[PDB]
Amino acid sequence: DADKLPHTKVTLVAPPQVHPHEQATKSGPKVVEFTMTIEEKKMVIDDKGTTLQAMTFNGSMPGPTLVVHEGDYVQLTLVNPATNAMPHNVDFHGATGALGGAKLTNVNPGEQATLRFKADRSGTFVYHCAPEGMVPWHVVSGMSGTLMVLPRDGLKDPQGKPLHYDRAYTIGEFDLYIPKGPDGKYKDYATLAESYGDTVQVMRTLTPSHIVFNGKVGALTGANALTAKVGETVLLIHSQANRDTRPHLIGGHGDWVWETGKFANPPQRDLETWFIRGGSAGAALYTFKQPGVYAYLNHNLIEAFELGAAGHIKVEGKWNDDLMKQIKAPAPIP
Amino acid sequence: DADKLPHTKVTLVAPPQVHPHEQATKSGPKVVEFTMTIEEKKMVIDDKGTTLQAMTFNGSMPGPTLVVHEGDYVQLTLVNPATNAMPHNVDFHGATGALGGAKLTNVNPGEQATLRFKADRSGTFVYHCAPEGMVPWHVVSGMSGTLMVLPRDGLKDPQGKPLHYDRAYTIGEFDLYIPKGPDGKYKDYATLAESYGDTVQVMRTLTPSHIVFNGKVGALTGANALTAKVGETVLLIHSQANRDTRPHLIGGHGDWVWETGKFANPPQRDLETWFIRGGSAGAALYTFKQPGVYAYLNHNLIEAFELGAAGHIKVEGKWNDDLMKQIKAPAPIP
Amino acid sequence: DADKLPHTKVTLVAPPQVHPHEQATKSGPKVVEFTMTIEEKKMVIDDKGTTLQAMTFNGSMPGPTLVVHEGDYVQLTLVNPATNAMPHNVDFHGATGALGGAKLTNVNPGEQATLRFKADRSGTFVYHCAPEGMVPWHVVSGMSGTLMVLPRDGLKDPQGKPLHYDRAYTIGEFDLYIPKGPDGKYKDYATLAESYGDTVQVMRTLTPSHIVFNGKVGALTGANALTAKVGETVLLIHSQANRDTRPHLIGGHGDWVWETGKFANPPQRDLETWFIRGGSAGAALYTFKQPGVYAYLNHNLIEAFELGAAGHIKVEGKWNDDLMKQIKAPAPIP
Amino acid sequence: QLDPAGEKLYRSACVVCHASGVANAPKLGDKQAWAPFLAQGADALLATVLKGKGAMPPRGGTAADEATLRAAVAYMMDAAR
C-alpha cells in the first residue's frame, strides 16, 4: 500500500542530461515525488530567427526525464503558474486509468494538482499534455517528455545477461508546424493563442516546417554536443510524442535497442537505424569503440539536414585501426 | 484433400463486432464458407455532412472480419451485383497464389465467383479489392477488411502460455482522399465514376483529407463505442490496407501485441503505442484494470484529433486507487 | 591483425543480381577487396521521358551489393573519375568509426581512396555517399546500395535451424524529388549543379514526385522481371537510404524476415508486409509454392502504383490446387 | 452588420476553446448554451472577455483591441441566433 512506503523526493535536471539514478537496486518499491512547473514562452527554434509560440514542462523541450523502478509509485505535483494563458494537464503513457492522469490533473493558470500512479510496467514511456479539445496543439508546441521505469535489477539482453550504461542522454524530437505569411516568411505572434488558427492549418498538411532535437536546430551541436569516451556505454533515450522517427548513430550502431521501448521484451542488436513510433519513447545502448565526432540523427536525411533533426556526440579516446583504417588516402587516380 | 473435407457456414457480422468463433478448438480442418456482396455507395464520413463515393465489401468500411483456424480452407463466394458500376475482385494476404486470389475472382457487375484457399498461416491478414490498373482507388475508397486465422490451439505468449480473450473488436482505419473545390469545401459527386479523376490528384499528394476508423469520423463513439468491463480481456484487431498507423489506448497498454499480425511470432508486452504497416493487420490484447471512457487512437495526434483517427472504449467497473490516485485535486498554488 | 590475413578480390555485378558468394563457409576471415567507380549521369526515370540528374556508385541505382562474412574485412577502393563534377565519399552503416568511412574517403573528381573496415556485425547494411553539407541531395540522387555481412555459419531461424536461399535479389527503393516548371511539367536540366536548388525545394516538401525500384518506373518488369520457380527459395534484399517503405509480395509472404536487417536477431515468419526504416536495409526469405506473375511492391499502394514502387517476379512451375482453387469461375448471377 | 475582423480574430485564436468546448467553453453555434449570454447583452459579454473568466484568459488570450474583441463577440453571438 503506497501510503505505507518510504517517500523520496527527486530533483529533476534539464535535457539532455538525466537525473542521477540507480539501475539495478536492492531497494523495494517506494513513492518517488517529482514537481514540474509549466512554462509557456516564445522560443527561437532555428538559425534564421524563426520563433515558436511554445509550451513546455519545466521550461525545456522535451520536459525532463523522470526515472523510477518497476513497482515504484510516481507522485507528480504539476504547477501551472498564473503567468500562463492556457489550462494544461498531464497524460503518462506509463500510467493506468483516467486517460493517463489527464482527467485528474486539469490545472488552470494559478492552479496545481498532485497525481500518484503505480509504475508497474518497465520501459521508456512518453508523457505529454492533453487538454480535452486541444490535444495536438499542446503536444506539437512542446509539451512532452519521458518517464523511464527501470527493471529492479537493471537492463538485460535476450539471454538475461546484465546490461549497464555509464551515462544516459535524453533526446526529444519535435515536429514543428510554424505558419508562413503571404510574403513567404515565418509568422511571429504576439501571444500564444493568436498563433493557433494558422498553426492548425499547417498541422493539417502533416508536413512539419522544422523537426528539431531538444527545442531547436543545432541544440545538440557545437558547445552543446553530447559527449562520450571510447569504452563508455551510453543509453540514448529518444521520445517522439506525435510523429515517427528513425534514429541512427553515424559511424556507430544500436548495440542493444528497444525500439518500442519496453524492457520486458528482448532488445534487438547491431541496428543501423531503429524506429520510434509517434507517441512513444524508445531506448538504445551503444559502447563507443572509436573516437571522433558522430552524428545522431533521424535517418530521413531531409528531416535531419534540411529540417533540423540531427545532433552530435563528441567522443574521446584511442583510434582503433583494426576496426577501420585508411589504406590509401585520397590521391590522384593512377 | 480439401474436396472431402466437411464444410461449415459462417454468418458474418458488421464491424466493430466479430462473428462468434472458437479460439482453441478440437475440430480438425474444414472448408469454411463465406459470402460477401460488393456495395458501391455514397457515404457520409463526418457529422458535418461530407460525402465519399465509397466502395465496400458487404456494405461496411472495413468489410467484415472472417475468422478461421490454421489449416482450414476459406471458400468465399464474391458477388458483384448488377447495381454496381465497376469490376471488383479480392486479394487475400492470407492466401498463396494468383495475386492473393485476385486473378481468379474478377467479377463484373452482375457476376459472382467462388474461390477456395488454404489458410495455412496464423495471423490477422488484410484482404482488399485489387482490380488491375485501379488498385489504389478501390482500396482507399473502402474495399478492405481482415481475415483472422487463429492457431488451432489458440493464442500463445512468448513462452507458449495460453492467452484468451473475452471479446474481439475489429477496427479498419481508412486514409481518405476527398477533393476540394474553389470554395475550399469538399466536393460532392453524383456518381462514383465522376469522383475518379479528382481523387487520383489528391492521392498523388500522399496527404489524406480525413483518416477514419470504420468509415466515419466518430464512428466508434456513442452507441457504437467499444465496450468492456474491468477484468475483461479484449482483442483489438487493427487493419490499414494502404498507409501506416500507430495505435494507442489512452490510459491503457497493449498487454500482448503482434504488431506485424502473425501469431507464430512471439508478441511484445507492455506497449504504449504499436505500429501497423500499410498493407497489414495487427492485433493487441488488453485486460482492463480501470473503469472509464478510454480513447483508442492513431498516435499521430493530428491524424487522430484533426483528421478523424480516434474512437472510444467505454469500460464499466470499480476504480482502483492503488494503480492511480488523485492525491490533490486542482486547487490554487499556495 | 588484418594485415597478414589472406586477401581476395571480388567482381561486382549489377542489380538486381548479387555477386556469387558462399552462405555457410568453411573459410577463415579474409580481407575482401572491392572497387567502385562513381558515375554522375542523366537518367530517364519514367515512361513519359522525365529525367533525373543522377549520381551513382558503379553506374546503377542502387549501387551493387557487396557480400562478405562476419569477421571479414571490407577493403574498398572508391574512384571518382575526372569526368565527374562533384566530390563524393562513402559511409558504410556496416562500419565502425569516422562517420562510417566518409571522413576517410573524400574524393574530388580525378581522385581515389582505399578504405578498410572490419565487418564485425552480421546483416544487410546501407552504404551511401555523404559529402559534408550535401548529404540528402547525394543520397536521393541515387548514391546508395547494400553491404550484406552473412554469418559465417549462414542464416538461422529463431530456433537456430539453418536457413538457405537458392538465389538473392537486391532491390533499392529511391524516393525522387524532381522539380516542376511554371507549366507544371517536370524540369530537365543541362547539368547536375543546375538541378541543385530546385531539388532542395522539392525535398523540403517531404513529398516524392516518384518512388522507384532500381532507378526507374517499371525497372523490375517485363524482360527485366525477377524470376524464380516453385520450390526455389529467394532472398529479397530491400534498401531505402532516406525514407520508410513497406515491402509486400502479392500472392506470397515473407517466410522469414529480418525487417531491421540484422541477422543475429531472430527473424519473424509469415509476414504479409514488412517495414524497412529509412536509412536501412532489410531482408526476406520466401520459398515459392505457386507459379505465375507476382508483384513485389511498397504497400502504400499510391506509392506503388501511382509513384512507381513496384516490380514483378515471374515464377515457373506447377499450380497447386490444394493451396488455391477456383471453385466457380466468374459467371452471371442467377 | 458584422465586421470581418471579428470572424478573423475568432478563427485565429478564440476557436481553440470555443470550437469544441475546452474547459466547458460555450461552443460556437450552440443555441441553447448561448441563450443566457445573448440575454446579458453584448457589452456584458465583452466586459467578461476583457477581464477573463475561469479558464478563459484576459482578452481571450489575445492582444486585440477592444473594437476587434467586440467584433469577435458579435460574430459569436450571431452564430447562436
Ligand code: HEM
Ligand atoms: C478573443 C477570443 C475569445 C472570445 C471573443 C471569447 C468569447 C467568450 C464569451 C463571449 C464568453 C461568455 C462570457 C461568459 O461566460 O459570461 C466566453 C466564455 C468562456 N470562454 Fe471564451 N473567448 C475567447 C477566447 C477563449 C479562449 C482562448 C479560451 C480557452 C483558453 C476560452 C474559454 C472560455 C471559457 C472556459 C468560458 C466560460 C467561462 C466560465 O464560465 O468559467 N475563451 N468566451
Ligand SMILES: [Cu+2]
Ligand atoms: Cu498544455
Ligand SMILES: [Cu+2]
Ligand atoms: Cu499520448
Ligand SMILES: [Cu+2]
Ligand atoms: Cu473494387
Ligand SMILES: [Cu+2]
Ligand atoms: Cu495487398
Ligand SMILES: [Cu+2]
Ligand atoms: Cu556523392
Ligand SMILES: [Cu+2]
Ligand atoms: Cu546513413
